[PDB]
Every structure is written in structure tokens, then in C-alpha cells.
Amino acid sequence: VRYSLDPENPTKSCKSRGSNLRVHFKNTRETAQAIKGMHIRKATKYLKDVTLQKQCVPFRRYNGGVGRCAQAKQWGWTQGRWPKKSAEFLLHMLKNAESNAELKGLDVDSLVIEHIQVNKAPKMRRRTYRAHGRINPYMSSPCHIEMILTEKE
């Protein structure tokens, strides 16, 4: 298919995509900003530390109510959080990207995460039961994830 902003050299490029997967959009948007431009051996070692809560994700745009941690001082920010589900899915297809890289013949000591965007998937609904005989929705807000990787030189 076609992605946003096709790479300038698809010979020395790689790409991966995950569609319609049930993560929060607002969590996955802000850890994809945390690894944009990041080398693939550093992004993996960062993403493992997000689950172990040794290193956090700074919530910049979707920050309402997010608590102040001490581990966000590295990022130049006050607020941070440790989404382990959100850092598991884009670690799962961080592996799929480097699966395609050796399948095309690329060096995984030179791959940077050039382009990673997160955009919304169609919401799926269920419902809650609130006071005085009313119905309100529990709508899940999944996401579409696409990433472009490129050898750095």
C-alpha cells in the first residue's frame, strides 16, 4: 500500500504497518514521538525500560491529569508515564520492521526510525449503565500504526 511521506530512497529503506489494533491512541501517539529519529538498538533498549519502569514517556500534548514523575527530566518535561501495553505493540512491530530489513538485505546497526506516525482507527463500542436508568457508551479508541525505517549515512 501507500504510506505518508514515502522515503527518498526505497532501496535503503524499510517499512512496517499495523492496522486497527486495540491500544489507546493517546498513549501510542506519545511514545511514538519518544522514539522518532531514534536508532533501532536504542529504541528497543528504551522500549524495554518503559515496561520495567526504569525510563518513562513524556506526555506533551495529551497531558491532562498526567502526574509529575522524576524520570521526565531527561526529556526536558515535567510529566511522564510508563505505558507498558503501548510500548509492547510498537516494540512488536519494531521487530517486524527489522524482519523485513534483513529480508531486503539491510544493516540493523544503521537503521534509524525515520518516520513513525499514529492515526486513529474506527471506534468500537460497548455500553455502561448509569444512574436513573440511562445508557452511556464505553467506546474503545484503537489506532493504526505505520513506521518507515532507513539506513543512516
Binding site: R127, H132, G133, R134, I135
Partner: peptide, 26 residues
Amino acid sequence: SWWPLPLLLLLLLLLGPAGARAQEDE
């Protein structure tokens, strides 16, 4: 499988009346 099924109409019915009553000065 795959293709699931439709749910149900909301069917909302009104209830409460201007909160907790209240009468103006006479």
C-alpha cells in the same frame, strides 16, 4: 464468525423534574 451482530436501540425515557423541586417566593 467474523461478521458479528447488531446490538439494541437506546430507547431513552425522560425522568427527573428540575432537580430537587424548589418554589419561588410568594
